[PDB]
Amino acid sequence: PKVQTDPPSVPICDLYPNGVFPKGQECEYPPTQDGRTAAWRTTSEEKKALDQASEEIWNDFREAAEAHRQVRKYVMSWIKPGMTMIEICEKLEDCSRKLIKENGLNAGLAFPTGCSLNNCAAHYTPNAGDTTVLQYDDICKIDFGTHISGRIIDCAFTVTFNPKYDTLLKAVKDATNTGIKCAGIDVRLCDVGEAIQEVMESYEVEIDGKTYQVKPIRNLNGHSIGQYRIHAGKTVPIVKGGEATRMEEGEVYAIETFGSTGKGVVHDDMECSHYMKNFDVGHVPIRLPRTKHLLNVINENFGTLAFCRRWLDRLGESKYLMALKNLCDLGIVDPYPPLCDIKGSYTAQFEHTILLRPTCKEVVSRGDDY
Template identity: 60%
Template structure:
């Protein structure tokens, strides 16, 4: 799930080629939507072999996925994500017994995160095979969310969906999920961003990918995928957030795309960014820019981050547009109480079922809530609930997104959501 940051300057294929991952962020070609993606690049970069392949999903999973991952991986033996050794001033951490002992203190958190990550991998593997032009967004969203609920064994605040499934098309970059009655259908020439999350005991894994069925969008998807891999590679303990943004921007802007005979530079969307993640908080304070904004804030040991990058053929700047579907209860002790009785009733339901996790109107409908629009508006107007409307670049442009979640363990960086697909 994306973060809009206005403080930044000027801020189905049935099989996919296995994407080889490395600490240096491989940028091999990948089968995406049934077509080989051949990137048009201004400058070439070398790729290196993987140090360790991430979890590839469990054998024995049903199609569609319905078997809980706890049954496929008994005794909490969930696959590790991609493990990346620290470098430079932090390379001592890799072999330090002190750091290894410190790492063992976080065993339960890591187990929860790996369980959530495995759910994400298995659900998205199925989704990437199934999603095709002609499908409506509501069907796609419910397929992903129902699969998540089944595989994570949804149980209140112990495990469940991390946030509403984002299904943003073309110039819409983020925060679009269908409301009731939405009949938007994916078209052959669409560029579709799929962004969903899974949580276990409030530990959220947030990961996103982009699908396109027309070869011409290959450079856009490759640019954003490589930019995300670059951000992950550059991230580490004590690394400045602005330096990560600068590296992402350099990679993104090294690409261009030819559309309708016109060569267009691919721009990072400067007011969208990655973010760190806290317990039951998808956005927890720090933002990871995707342009150079000279932010001197540093990443710290133990922090959980989502690196997500967005590329655009438009202006490289998004604004709120359209009907809102995403919401979350405001965090903090100073949240006022609503005056309207309908708002009080709705707030009780939101607090009971979602807490500070994001939700959408479809989730309220699923709970049996009705006639809640006035109450929801009152909660938003009172600052009790925060709205997150769709974020869009200029009409006629195309945007893409890739995202992974990683944790800065004391002795190694673990890219939890990494899989064979991306």
């Protein structure tokens, strides 16, 4: 077992050749059983026994989360205003590739690195020729994910340079942490939405002499993660009045939380860059040779994971966004264009992937940074 170099280059598995990877923050489930605590499963009964039955699955999440932690520390180390996010995304992606030692689909990037600026919320990454220099008075949402054998971990944070945004950052961080602690086994999603809205709205923001009230973006919400499936079909809300579905043992969730000094809703603003093949659709005929070729290329290289046009240009494929929209109309791939708020507004996001262990709740994405 060796150690990591100052510019992170050693693969995570090389740092832990034993096979066991650092555990996330273990937390007992909330005492939502009418006062009765859940500190009765931590004892090594059959609960722990069947927890051990899925130990190998967890280790993949652990290594992915560790890789995410090192990558985000590296990004925090050198990120600064004045440099465009094309090279920022290139650096983040290449560092993550080296740290995860990607090989086909057994390991690699779960989805393109999102870097949303100002009113933009999510699902934005620069395309080819995108000349956007960063500014001192900017806020950015760095959302990126890594996976091991399809065990996806999703985490996101917000970077700021002007110290006028710390109130909004702390509000969104508190909302995300409250959603984290509120989540548990056999709890309704409407409850977590209740908690998130009741913690996050009780904050006030003073920006540029104007006092705003921070509100959730009712359009976005958290999601459940599946095997090579970023969205398993369950969405945890961040506003009041949602579904009454429960969370069950053995599932993983991404507890996202967005806060804006705007209208609390988002729409499609600029050119789409994120794309995702549908996990549920089967075989749909195609009539264009270029479209067929692009489809088989993407299903070989990106499978069901999300991809961006940069990842296709990185593969040497050109003249392809045509067949790409063709797959979009055919329903094979669903575009995910950037979501943006009103101009002049600001948005902050913090995200963590949580594990519902039989004995406890592990937030594998937890780090010392946040």
